[PDB]
Amino acid sequence: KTTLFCASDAKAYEKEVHNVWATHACVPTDPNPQEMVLANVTENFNMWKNDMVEQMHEDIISLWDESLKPCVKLTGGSAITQACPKVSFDPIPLHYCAPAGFAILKCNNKTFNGTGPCRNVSTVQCTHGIKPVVSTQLLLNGSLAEEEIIIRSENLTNNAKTIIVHLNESVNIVCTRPNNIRQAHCNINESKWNNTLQKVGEELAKHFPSKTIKFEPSSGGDLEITTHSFNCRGEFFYCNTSDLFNGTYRNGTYNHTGRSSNGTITLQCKIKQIINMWQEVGRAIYAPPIEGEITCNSNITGLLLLRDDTETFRPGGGDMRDNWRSELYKYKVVE
Numbered sequence: 001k002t003t004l005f006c007a008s009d010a011k012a013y014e015k016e017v018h019n020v021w022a023t024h025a026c027v028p029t030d031p032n033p034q035e036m037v038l039a040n041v042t043e044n045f046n047m048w049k050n051d052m053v054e055q056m057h058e059d060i061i062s063l064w065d066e067s068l069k070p071c072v073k074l075t076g077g078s079a080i081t082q083a084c085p086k087v088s089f090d091p092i093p094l095h096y097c098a099p100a101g102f103a104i105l106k107c108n109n110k111t112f113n114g115t116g117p118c119r120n121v122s123t124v125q126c127t128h129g130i131k132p133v134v135s136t137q138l139l140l141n142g143s144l145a146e147e148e149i150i151i152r153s154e155n156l157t158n159n160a161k162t163i164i165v166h167l168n169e170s171v172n173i174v175c176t177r178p179n180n181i182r183q184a185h186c187n188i189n190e191s192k193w194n195n196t197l198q199k200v201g202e203e204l205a206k207h208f209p210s211k212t213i214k215f216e217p218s219s220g221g222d223l224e225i226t227t228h229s230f231n232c233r234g235e236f237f238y239c240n241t242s243d244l245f246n247g248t249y250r251n252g253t254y255n256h257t258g259r260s261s262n263g264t265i266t267l268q269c270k271i272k273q274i275i276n277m278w279q280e281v282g283r284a285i286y287a288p289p290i291e292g293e294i295t296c297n298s299n300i301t302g303l304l305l306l307r308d309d310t311e312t313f314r315p316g317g318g319d320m321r322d323n324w325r326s327e328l329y330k331y332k333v334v335e
């Protein structure tokens with residue numbers, strides 16, 4: 001363990017806050033990317049015990065609190081007020097790099113579940129570009145598995161450990177508050193969701209070989225975790241997923257029990273101003289939403305699940321360290 005440094009293609013002239021942060025905190029990425037393969041050198045990784053995840057977590061916390069200043073911040077009996085202007089918000093890729101005297105080993109097994117021994121390992125200076133996308137239930141704008149869908153979890157038998165589902169084909173999702181000012185909706189093409197969830201059921205059945213797979217909405221908790229919550233153009237979208245995680249996989253076939261209309265699922269959402277923070281235990285209070293068409297067209301690249309005759313799976317999340325682990329799993333900082 002050392003202190004790693006970030007590398008970004010951010011531009012000192014753009015007023016978008018990811019660029020503003022990265023110019024002030026990261027070095028320019030090098031087009032000197034020397035990757036060195038070692039086929040008979042073999043190393044052990046644990047994506048769930050990886051200090052790079054905590055370093056990136058600290059970095060993104062700093063980013064958000066220097067870039068999404070809430071009008072009010074309520075923590076531990078104290079309140080903190082500051083200017084809370086609307087900003088230009090669109091995440092950019094970030095690379096994480098070992099300093100001199102250190103390397104980063106990268107597992108080239110296309111089917112690696114993030115834990116155990118990898119036989120094909122390569123050394124690099126920096127990770128690939130990672131967008132610090134804060135979200136729950138669905139992992140957005142990530143990178144896709146190269147072969148089959150991969151299931152990752154610290155302990156599959158423990159029902160309290162988060163399950164990361166790494167997809168191999170993206171599912172487009174278009175969320176929009178169009179031109180009540182806090183009502184918005186997401187559109188998802190239900191046939192891609194159908195095929196995606198059946199193949200996900202296939203892999204989940206491989207880890208549970210009876211065992212009829214069930215997808216049901218989030219049980220309970222804070223609105224941030226019981227909905228697909230994310231930030232788009234600076235606004236905090238909370239999107240109902242009752243019609244999304246709602247189906248059954250049995251006897252090798254998937255049937256979607258959530259309601260859809262002419263072939264698309266639409267999630268109902270509110271843009272909220274009181275936010276249960278993910279950075280720490282507390283609440284953040286922002287101004288009402290901007291004027292105009294607020295839309296993000298994103299790619300679903302992964303899922304965050306929690307497991308309850310059968311096994312039921314519900315969308316999870318809330319600890320965005322899992323969001324970072326979904327991209328940092330191939331890596332291991334070495335001396």
Ligand SMILES: CNCc1ccc2c(c1)[C@@H](CC[C@@H](O)CO)[C@H](CNC(=N)N)[C@H]2NC(=O)C(=O)Nc1ccc(Cl)c(F)c1
Pocket residue numbers: 134135136222224225228229230231236237275276277278279280281282283317318319320321
């Ligand atoms: C079984 N699950 C465990 C679980 C469950 C919920 C939560 C955690 C853990 C915490 C993670 C803390 C850890 O990371 C240490 O730093 C975090 C605690 N904090 C407060 N309850 N206030 C809390 N998650 C959030 O509130 C959160 O994700 N909100 C949020 C905001 C904006 C956007 Cl756009 C968004 F999509 C989400």
Ligand SMILES: *[C@@H]1O[C@H](CO)[C@@H](O)[C@H](O)[C@H]1NC(C)=O
Pocket residue numbers: 113114115116117151152153156
């Ligand atoms: C991941 O693979 C390793 C073997 O390489 C195995 O020990 C571990 O149980 C696997 N975990 C999951 C969640 O499949």
Ligand SMILES: *[C@@H]1O[C@H](CO)[C@@H](O)[C@H](O)[C@H]1NC(C)=O
Pocket residue numbers: 146147148149168169199200202203
């Ligand atoms: C994705 O993985 C599934 C199995 O999990 C497979 O059936 C499907 O063909 C894969 N898609 C690719 C490789 O494009």
Ligand SMILES: *[C@@H]1O[C@H](CO)[C@@H](O)[C@H](O)[C@H]1NC(C)=O
Pocket residue numbers: 154155156157158
């Ligand atoms: C996971 O939990 C089970 C039971 O709680 C335990 O037997 C096992 O050793 C744990 N670790 C694993 C499977 O890696």
Ligand SMILES: *[C@@H]1O[C@H](CO)[C@@H](O)[C@H](O)[C@H]1NC(C)=O
Pocket residue numbers: 223226227240241242
């Ligand atoms: C999602 O919508 C369903 C039906 O519209 C509702 O029963 C459920 O409580 C909603 N979830 C949240 C977190 O509001």
Ligand SMILES: *[C@@H]1O[C@H](CO)[C@@H](O)[C@H](O)[C@H]1NC(C)=O
Pocket residue numbers: 216217242243246257258259
């Ligand atoms: C699936 O959706 C239907 C209609 O939207 C709803 O009645 C049902 O309760 C949902 N399944 C759940 C919540 O497990």
Ligand SMILES: *[C@@H]1O[C@H](CO)[C@@H](O)[C@H](O)[C@H]1NC(C)=O
Pocket residue numbers: 190191194195254255256263264
């Ligand atoms: C998936 O959705 C389409 C509608 O877009 C539906 O006609 C089809 O039967 C569904 N397939 C499965 C396996 O649920």
Ligand SMILES: *[C@@H]1O[C@H](CO)[C@@H](O)[C@H](O)[C@H]1NC(C)=O
Pocket residue numbers: 090091133140141230231232295296297298299
């Ligand atoms: C995903 O990337 C696209 C393209 O830059 C962007 O429009 C969208 O807002 C991104 N999604 C999120 C949640 O940032």
